[PDB]
Subunit: 153 residues, 3 copies
């Protein structure tokens, strides 16, 4: 599976240009926390990840009664387990047509505020097939304004 990722700021672009934990073969792509943020105790926070993405896979014939955009998954990283933060929707399902910012809905199970920091890695993108992932940085996902493409401001 190949991800095309639009970074929503120069700061975010710099993070993904120097991605330090992605290796050839990996089934998950770590995503960064992109801004220091305080998560309220016993709360759900919709944490913006500063990127938009599409996933590309080979077309397949499927029962329903070359390369195509496909749905993909947002998993917690195993290392989230040492924190009090949990993914509210368990596993995120990003449909093939979504052009919005990728968000992690994080439950803070602690009675204390939780500080997340730029460069923390709490979630990862994954293919439905679990196949190795590649990615590249692009300026737009498609021609639409939500896709960050097309004419004008």
């Amino acid at each position: 599976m190949h991800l095309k990722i639009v970074c929503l700021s120069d700061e975010v672009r710099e993070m993904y240009k120097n991605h330090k934990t992605h290796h050839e073969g990996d089934s998950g792509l770590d995503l960064f926390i992109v801004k220091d943020e305080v998560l309220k105790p016993k709360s759900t926070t919709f944490v913006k990840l500063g990127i938009k993405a599409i996933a590309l896979q080979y077309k397949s014939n499927y029962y329903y009664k070359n390369i195509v955009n496909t749905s993909f998954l947002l998993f917690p990283r195993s290392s989230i387990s040492k924190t009090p933060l949990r993914l509210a929707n368990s596993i995120g399902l990003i449909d093939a047509g979504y052009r919005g910012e990728i968000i992690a809905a994080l439950d803070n199970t602690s009675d204390q505020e939780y500080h997340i920091k730029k460069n923390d890695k709490l979630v990862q993108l994954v293919s439905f097939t679990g196949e190795p992932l590649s990615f590249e940085l692009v300026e737009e996902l498609d021609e639409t304004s939500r896709g960050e493409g097309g004419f004008g401001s």
Copy 2:
């Protein structure tokens, strides 16, 4: 992936007659979830999933296993799916149930027509469905 769905009452049939990687499932009856609880919420349907046969390593159409995901909008409630993602094995013929944890210190009211969970294929392929009398 194609689902054949048995609705377990005419009220439920009505909901699915008047109903993409996930197929939203409805809460089919108003219900109060106790504070700090797990409730097995019955969804009033049985279902089998059909996909093309594949050669797999071990040791035309087949019924296959499928998944029960939370909807992303569950996040806006205090309810969480207890078993994370439900696995419905190919052999299952029972009613589909969502095990919902109410993390609130107060009771939570779910209503008929609420959509908290969805059925998903292992491949994330588009889903179709039809209503049947029998699996």
Copy 3:
């Protein structure tokens, strides 16, 4: 999907030789020793096994049998307990050689006793295809694979 499983003790080998729970999409994994989980805690519970998953090679877009990634799911029956899988679903990458661990949140205000033979989690293929398994002594020639020259 076919799993090659290394059991890390004879006690664990005894369990998997006599499985009893296993065309199924999930392979149940055992709790392998009695353990007490503290209240309001996350415990990294060691499952006493290492495992590689094998599938037929498939062509994938990226810019005969192979090692493949696989998943650690809670069992549906975990729902009746106060235990929850901290990371939702575990992702085990192709060829991973460490002991498989279940990170379990005890959401109770009471300590929770897990017991040898309890089944709380299961291994699952990304395709949901039936699973087979066999017991092996090593995954590869490396010490982390439990193989190769000893001492």
